[PDB]
Design a protein around this ligand. Structure first.
Ligand SMILES: [Mg+2]
Ligand SMILES: [Zn+2]
Lengths: 49, 147, 49, 98, 91, 97, 1095
DNA sequence: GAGGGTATTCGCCGCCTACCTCTCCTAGCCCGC
DNA sequence: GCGGGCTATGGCGGCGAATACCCTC
RNA sequence: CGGAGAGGUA
């Protein structure tokens, strides 16, 4: 619900997510960029980092 | 029934009552995130959020006085409607009815406007930043350089 | 978008007359307008992709 | 789960807020439509900028002036009621309107 | 459409524009000629049932597959009868 | 002159349509107030010299410098990721000569 | 042969033109100057209208007053009226206002008479209506000491328009009509896809037309009497399902005023008040004229109405019903014949021009309406026999409206003062975007087009290049605006196949019913075309070969469609439209050079352009110069009177350039009225001079002029050929402050006297001092509660120069200061800028580029005689961009500089047969002119290149092809092949590299989102956007991206720790949590959403 | 008059990036000094 | 009498949902 | 350095 709210239609996404009580398992490029964490790709994968 | 069941199952599966749609209290954002500045000389120009909070507070206090002192049902109902409208405009100004406009006939920036659009929080502050150790200048061709 | 059946009959070495220049300005400007519209249109598609 | 934050994030959850949650977030109530005074250039009380709700406006100081040093750390003012802490607290604390 | 709008509608999986019907079962067709409407009936080789489209406007041409589409001609399962762009959701 | 030795720099031109819009070079001080761009990276940057401008970034930490030196160095990026054709190829005056 | 034989003291610039100009170019500021004297009703406008509009000469203010008055109460027992507006002398001269800060305005008075309708007592007074901003002689307004230009607005003329569309479902051609009023309510009449004519009064339900037809008083008898020949008209009543006059009225009320008693009287009031009274509906004079012209109602009675009428509203229906069918003619009863047809909404007959006068009139009108409401309110709450005109009038709304228009409008624009041409071009702009026009994004590609109706009224070339493409235009050269706002262009009447005199001004609407010919057409002074066929714009701008007996008019000159700036490009017809647009726009960006020099290959539109711009000084009256100095000229008139002109030296323009006037006459010369007596910023002998003549080569060179880069010699720097002066303006004031009182003085604590060496007794720096980046210009201290806090003015980063002037306004000297201040000290610093690497240059043909390198003058290609070239331009840029005009300009510039002599020993050569005398021979450094579309042919250029004079010895350095044999200054060997050389005209654009260089490591930060600030003026940092993030993610570089987004931008502790680590030899710490995520969390919580982070 | 099937119209959502310069943020009116 | 503070009918395409018009029971 | 409007460069 955090990657969809930054793309389009923030109000609708937020209001539906709040009703469905969705939990965000932060795993993605955009989400890790937003929360200031190493992206899971390239030199940020476990075998490399 | 498909859409009705969508919403009803959404509210049934989790321990989330549908009573959160009707509000009894209204949170207030911290002041340093809605600051008020002064133009040249020392004259303060109000922010949009402060004006909407002020309207809601005024309406709430006046309705409270009217109810406490006792009054005909019409006045109390009218004031409750005017409080409902103010609270609606606080969260989302312009969704229903005429936008609450400030000086110069321009709609105010509600709390919802902070999150939406190309100038909203996300696409202006979280997906892009202003970074130190950077500069800018015009480019010219150096033929003696190496790749 | 239709062709002018005249047509323009002088090269830019010789020098176009006044009417030839005026009827050339049409296509000259339509291209720039379309270019602005297209640069506006492409970024949205790239972001969606 | 983690209050402010601090890394080792695992999930970010969202949901509707009940009146109890909204009253628990708030450090006080706003019940006067006054933002700031012009003569003293200070926030009013029970307004939208109150220092007894959102936090001190000067590091380790009180609107009373009773305590204006770090030695008076953590004590809630006995005269004005403003807690003595750093001014950054105004970016965090919230209030509510009943 | 033949440019960036065409790309946008391809990636958006929208109904194209000049949507051309596509057969759903191999069989011959009793092509009919009329103004503002063309009746194309799918006569399957098995003969179970015959699908038909009579709303085809005369403006659009008939696709040339294998000779132009003609009366009483067998067609494949996915052959596009008319000319234009097929709708992705039907293929 | 000693401090800036062997310290890569990131140059960027807007719009950044593709990946090669940011590349890492090595700084050598010159005379003037303009940036001197190697002629073979213009196609990658889609840049010209009729008034264009560019930004400059400096990676600080060891990981950032290693990334600049190995991943983003200009001499290691000669082929287009989209198609594989070379992009540091000679053009215009070089082709004529 | 010469260019300007009318101006008394003009240079003898010879021309290649072959065609005579019947008419002289009008004044280039007449629109702005005339539309305002119409507003104030000056005697000059009255005289102008006498020989034209003597029937009813009324000014804007008079018209507004007459329309407003009389103001009477409901009972009609009293009245108030206005008349005879009057202006007094301006309070201060233009220079005084521009210096102090006052607005250039004069008092306005009106005679107000109050009449009591039951006692007969009449009381009259002269009521002051406020200060009225006045227009300077140059067409500008000084508002708060700043010059401004009120741009003209293109808008859609009010009237009735019919349009056509194709129905997708049934392929039926649905029609429509819309009555567009001024300040009124809309009224549509559609034909939908069921053959049911309907109405959409305002934005209500689609009521059938028969509803309103009957409600107006008609019956089925009359409805079928006039309507009925259309099947749909009768079918409308057949299936109306409603009938009755009162029934119809109550239906209209049900659709108009929901929720109130539907009474017949109330419906009458509502309807005939919305659409017929006087004040809710105003078609206006232009709207009434257009409606009468379209619906063929009257061709007689002078327009004396501004309201709708039954005949018009029924003629609209008749027109629509006839239109839908196939009819192509109608004659409404008691009306002249008129065809049936749709209306093109882009035509220049269907869109008029709102000039400065009309806009100001509209604003005054709204202010007067507010005042009228106030006066009517107060006219019933005050006792009789105590009311006087002064006791009811409140001027506040009018002054407020004037202030708001002149300060907060999209048409009142800051004037452009880069050079003389930019301001003149600004004063002649036509914009479509404004309060009442299109939108910069919602506007389509059909309003950004070149319409055939624009030929001779709007220039098709000079438009912006970005989002405003097609929305801002420029008025043409010979064009004028008529009383109703429709632009007219001159034409030369041709009679019986003879191109005669007596120019007549036409409009687009009128011009659409004639055939006009091309100006550059063959005529033989006998009124008979030499050639058989001539291209002519047939009806809809369709150029066609046509018989010579059909032509009805002729263009005045072959220079009629272009604007002023586009008319200064020589060999314009050899350049493509894109590059011509680039060059026309770039001519307005050139900076004034320290010394100006006129071109050698100009066009001719440079003397009038300079004189009309008004930056030169023109002698008021003829006389003999008495004493001429650098600061003042004194003409001793022919009647014993002396008038001393004062020259403004080293002044500052709105854009930081330097304005400097220099006399060009001697102490014994005799001058004539209208003669140029001094020069301006970009003028040389009274002609525009925006650049310099340089010797150019057209070869590639070592890859330094690669991809539009340029190579310059070092002579242009040593000799100051392209040097310019710029001026900055630093201002600081001392307020009263809540703290209380602040002073400017040398007493700055903690600073030694050494730093304050350049400071003086008062506090300001000494004139003639040198200031560098960081230096006290005005030393002060403010007690922030000693508490004295030094907030002294400093030289901005990257600034330097010399302090050349200081202005200080003191409250003690009863100055016109703002509220709450005491001092307004101001400073000026000026510095000369030489051409450097990174500066932008360009010609007049869209050939732009930055300076790649500045070679030493030793290793430069030099001619056989030893003369180095000045500039080198690459070969690969020309043939691709279709701007070959620069090469022809170079050839002709070489011919002009070298001087020539055609050898007509035995007859003039056939290539010089049509070459005017005085052009068969020239001396070195001769100045010539090639008009924009009628100039030098290629054969003439070849011939002139074939015969040029030797330099000192009998050597011709450039051969017939125009190419010389150069030498390699870097190696010494001669280049294997010859090169093209010559003189072209180069300008220095206002895009210097000193203004575009910026760097940062740390500094000011934002407060809410704790990120660096944006801008070169508060240090600020470059922004790492979203596509750069995509690129960094595609590289697979996680750590650089993380550091960029965390420790360089908004990680408060991280920034300080990183700085402390780098300054020392430590290693960079780990990044933390950004600061823009916590703000988002708080906002989401404030929206009543329980957001939490779960471990 | 309710049902089910069509049409029809209205509201909302979306519409590239980076940088530079310049001017202005209510009106009325009631109380206080 | 003047100043300061308090209050009160020139986008357009896609799409879905809230609702006109007509045959059936 | 917060907002609105105007103009401009790539
Ligand atoms: Mg460029
Ligand atoms: Zn206290």
């Amino acid at each position: 619900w955090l990657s969809a709210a930054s793309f389009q239609e923030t109000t609708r996404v937020l209001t539906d997510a709040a009703i469905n009580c969705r939990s965000d398992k932060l795993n993605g490029l955009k989400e890790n960029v937003i929360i200031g964490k190493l992206i899971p790709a390239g030199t940020g994968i476990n075998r490399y980092r | 029934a498909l859409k009705r069941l969508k919403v009803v199952a959404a509210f049934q599966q989790s321990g989330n009552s549908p009573m959160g749609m009707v509000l009894d209290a209204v949170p207030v954002i911290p002041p340093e995130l809605r600051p008020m500045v002064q133009l040249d000389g020392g004259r303060f120009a109000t922010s949009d959020l402060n004006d909407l909070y002020r309207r809601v507070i005024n309406r709430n206090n006046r309705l409270k006085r009217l109810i406490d002192l006792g009054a005909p049902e019409i006045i109390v109902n009218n004031e409750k409607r005017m409080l409902q409208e103010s609270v609606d405009a606080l969260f989302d100004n312009g969704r229903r009815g005429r936008p609450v406009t400030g000086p110069g006939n321009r709609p105010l920036k509600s709390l919802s406007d902070l999150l939406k659009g190309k100038q909203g929080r996300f696409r202006q502050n979280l997906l892009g930043k202003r970074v130190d150790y950077s500069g800018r200048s015009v480019i010219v061709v150096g033929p003696q350089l190496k790749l | 978008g239709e062709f002018i059946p005249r047509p323009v009959k002088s090269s830019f070495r010789e020098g176009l007359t006044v009417l030839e220049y005026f009827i050339n300005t049409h296509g000259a400007r339509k291209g720039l307008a379309d270019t602005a519209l297209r640069t506006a249109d492409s970024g949205y598609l790239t972001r969606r992709l | 789960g983690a209050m402010l934050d601090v890394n080792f994030f695992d999930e970010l959850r969202i949901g509707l807020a009940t009146a109890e949650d909204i009253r628990q977030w708030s450090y006080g109530e706003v019940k006067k439509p006054e933002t700031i005074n012009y003569r003293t250039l200070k926030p009013e009380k029970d307004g939208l900028f109150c220092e007894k709700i959102f936090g001190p406006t000067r590091d380790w100081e009180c609107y009373c002036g009773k305590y204006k040093r770090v030695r008076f750390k953590g004590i809630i003012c006995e005269r004005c009621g403003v807690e003595v802490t750093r001014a950054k607290v105004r970016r965090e604390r919230m209030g509510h309107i009943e | 459409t033949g440019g960036l709008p065409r790309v946008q509608e391809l990636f958006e999986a929208r109904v194209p524009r000049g949507k051309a019907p596509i057969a759903d079962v191999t069989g011959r067709v009793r092509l009919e000629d009329g103004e503002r409407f063309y009746k194309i009936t799918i006569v399957p080789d098995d003969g179970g049932e015959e699908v038909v489209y009579d709303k085809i406007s005369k403006r659009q041409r008939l696709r040339v597959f294998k000779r132009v589409l003609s009366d009483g001609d067998h067609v494949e399962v996915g052959q596009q009868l008319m000319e234009g762009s097929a709708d992705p959701h039907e293929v | 002159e000693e401090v800036i030795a062997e310290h890569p720099v990131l140059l960027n031109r807007a719009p950044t349509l593709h990946r090669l819009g940011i590349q890492a070079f090595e700084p050598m001080l010159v005379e003037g107030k303009a940036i001197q761009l190697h002629p073979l990276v213009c196609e990658a940057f889609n840049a010209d010299f009729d008034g264009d401008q560019m930004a400059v970034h400096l990676p600080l930490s060891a990981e950032a410098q290693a990334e600049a030196r190995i991943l983003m160095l200009s001499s290691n990026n000669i082929l287009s990721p989209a198609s594989g054709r070379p992009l540091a190829m000679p053009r215009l005056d070089m082709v004529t000569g | 042969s010469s260019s300007n034989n009318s101006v008394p003291g003009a240079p003898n610039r010879v021309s290649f033109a072959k065609l005579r100009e019947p008419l002289e170019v009008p004044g280039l500021l007449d629109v702005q100057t005339d539309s305002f004297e119409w507003l104030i009703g000056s005697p000059r406008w009255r005289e102008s209208a006498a020989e034209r509009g003597d029937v009813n000469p009324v000014g804007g203010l008079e018209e507004v007053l007459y329309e407003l008055s009389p103001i009477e109460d409901f009972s009609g027992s009293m009245s108030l009226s206005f008349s005879d507006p009057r202006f007094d002398d301006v309070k201060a001269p233009v220079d005084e206002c521009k210096d102090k800060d006052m607005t250039y305005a004069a008092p306005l008075f009106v005679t107000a008479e109050f009449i009591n309708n039951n006692t007969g007592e009449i009381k009259s007074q002269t009521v002051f209506m406020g200060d009225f901003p006045m227009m300077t002689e140059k067409g500008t307004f000084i508002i708060n000491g700043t010059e401004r230009v009120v741009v003209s607005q293109l808008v859609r003329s009010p009237g009735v328009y019919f349009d056509e569309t194709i129905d997708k479902s049934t392929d039926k051609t649905l029609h429509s009509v819309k009555v567009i009023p001024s300040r009124g309510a809309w009224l549509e009449f559609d034909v939908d896809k069921r053959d049911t004519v309907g109405v959409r009064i305002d934005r209500k339900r689609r009521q059938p037309v028969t509803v309103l037809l009957k409600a107006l008083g008609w019956t089925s008898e009359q409805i079928v009497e006039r309507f009925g020949f259309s099947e749909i008209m009768r079918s409308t009543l057949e299936k109306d399902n409603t009938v009755g006059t009162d029934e119809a009225l109550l239906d209209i009320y049900r659709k108009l005023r929901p929720g109130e008693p539907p009474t017949k009287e109330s419906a009458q009031t509502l309807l005939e008040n919305l659409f017929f009274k006087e004040k809710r509906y105003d078609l206006a004079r232009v709207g009434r004229y257009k409606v009468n012209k379209k619906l063929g109602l009257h061709v007689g009675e002078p327009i004396t109405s501004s309201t709708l009428t039954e005949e018009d509203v029924v003629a609209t229906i008749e027109y629509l019903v006839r239109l839908h069918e196939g009819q192509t003619t109608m004659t409404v009863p008691g009306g002249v014949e008129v065809p049936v047809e749709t209306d093109d909404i882009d035509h220049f007959g269907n869109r008029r021009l709102r000039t400065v006068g009309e806009l100001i009139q509209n604003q005054i009108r709204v202010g007067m309406s507010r005042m009228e409401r106030v006066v009517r309110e107060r006219m019933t709450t005050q006792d009789v026999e105590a009311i006087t005109p002064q006791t009811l009038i409140n001027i506040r709304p009018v002054v407020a409206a004037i202030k708001e228009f002149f300060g907060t409008s999209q048409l009142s624009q800051f004037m452009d003062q880069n050079n003389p041409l930019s301001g003149l071009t600004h004063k002649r702009r036509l914009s479509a975007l404004g309060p009442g026009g299109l939108s910069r994004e919602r506007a389509g590609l059909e309003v950004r087009d070149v319409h055939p109706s624009h030929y001779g009224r709007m220039c098709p070339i000079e438009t912006p290049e970005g989002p405003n493409i097609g929305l801002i235009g420029s008025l043409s050269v010979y064009a004028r605006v008529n009383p109703f706002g429709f632009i007219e262009t001159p034409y030369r009447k041709v009679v019986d196949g003879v191109v005669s005199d007596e120019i007549v001004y036409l409009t687009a609407d009128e011009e659409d019913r004639h055939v006009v010919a091309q100006a550059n057409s063959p005529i033989d002074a006998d009124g008979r075309f030499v050639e058989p066929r001539v291209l002519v714009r047939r009806k809809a701008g369709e150029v066609e070969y046509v018989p010579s007996s059909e032509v009805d008019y002729m263009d005045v000159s072959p220079r009629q469609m272009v604007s002023v700036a586009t008319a200064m490009i020589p060999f314009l017809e050899h350049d493509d439209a894109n590059r011509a647009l680039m060059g026309a726009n770039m001519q307005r960006q050139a900076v004034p050079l320290v010394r100006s020099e006129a071109p050698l290959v100009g066009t001719g539109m440079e003397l009038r352009a300079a004189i009309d711009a008004g930056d030169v000084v023109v002698a008021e009256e003829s006389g003999v110069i008495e004493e001429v100095s650098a600061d003042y000229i004194t003409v001793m008139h022919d009647n014993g009177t002396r008038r001393t002109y004062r020259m403004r030296k080293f002044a500052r323009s709105n854009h930081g350039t330097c304005a400097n006037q220099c006399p060009i006459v001697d102490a014994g010369d005799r001058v004539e009225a209208g003669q140029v007596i001094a020069d301006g910023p970009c003028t040389d002998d009274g002609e525009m001079a925006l650049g310099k003549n340089l010797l150019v080569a057209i070869m590639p060179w070592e890859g330094h002029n690669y991809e539009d880069a340029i190579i310059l010699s070092n002579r242009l720097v040593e000799e100051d050929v392209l040097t310019s002066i710029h001026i900055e303006e630093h201002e600081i004031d001392a307020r009263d402050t809540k703290l209380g009182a602040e002073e400017i003085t040398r007493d700055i604590p903690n600073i030694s006297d050494e730093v304050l060496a350049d400071l003086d007794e008062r506090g300001i720096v000494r004139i003639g001092a040198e200031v560098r980046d960081g230096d006290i210009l005005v030393g002060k201290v403010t007690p922030k509660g000693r508490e004295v806090r030094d907030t002294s003015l400093k030289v901005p980063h990257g600034e330097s120069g010399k302090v050349i002037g200081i202005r200080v306004f003191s409250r003690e000297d009863e100055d016109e200061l703002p509220a709450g201040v005491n001092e307004l000290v101001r400073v000026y610093v000026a510095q000369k800028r030489k051409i450097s690497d990174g500066d932008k240059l360009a010609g007049r043909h869209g050939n732009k580029g930055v300076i790649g390198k500045i070679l030493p003058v030793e290793d430069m290609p030099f001619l056989a005689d030893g003369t180095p070239v000045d500039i080198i331009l690459n070969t690969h840029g020309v043939p691709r961009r279709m701007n070959i005009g620069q090469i022809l300009e170079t050839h002709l510039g070489w011919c002009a500089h070298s001087g020539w002599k055609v050898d007509a020993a035995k007859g003039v050569p056939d290539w010089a047969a049509r070459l005017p005398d005085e052009l068969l021979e020239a001396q070195p450094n001769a100045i010539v002119s090639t008009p924009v579309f009628d100039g030098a042919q290629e054969a003439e250029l070849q011939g002139l290149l074939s015969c040029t004079l030797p330099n000192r010895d009998g050597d011709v350095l450039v051969d017939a092809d125009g190419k010389a044999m150069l030498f390699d200054g870097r190696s010494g060997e001669p280049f294997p092949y010859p090169v093209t050389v010559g003189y072209m005209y180069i300008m220095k654009l206002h895009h210097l590299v000193d203004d575009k260089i910026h760097a940062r490591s740390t500094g000011p930060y934002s407060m809410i989102t704790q990120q660096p600030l944006g801008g070169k003026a508060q240090f600020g940092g470059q922004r790492f956007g979203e596509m750069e993030c995509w690129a960094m993610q595609a590289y697979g570089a996680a750590y650089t991206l993380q550091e960029l987004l965390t420790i360089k931008s908004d990680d408060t502790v991280g920034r300080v720790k990183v700085y402390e680590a780098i300054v020392k030899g430590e290693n960079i710490p780990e990044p933390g949590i950004p600061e823009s995520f916590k703000v988002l969390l708080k906002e989401l919580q404030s929206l009543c959403l329980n957001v939490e982070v779960l471990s």
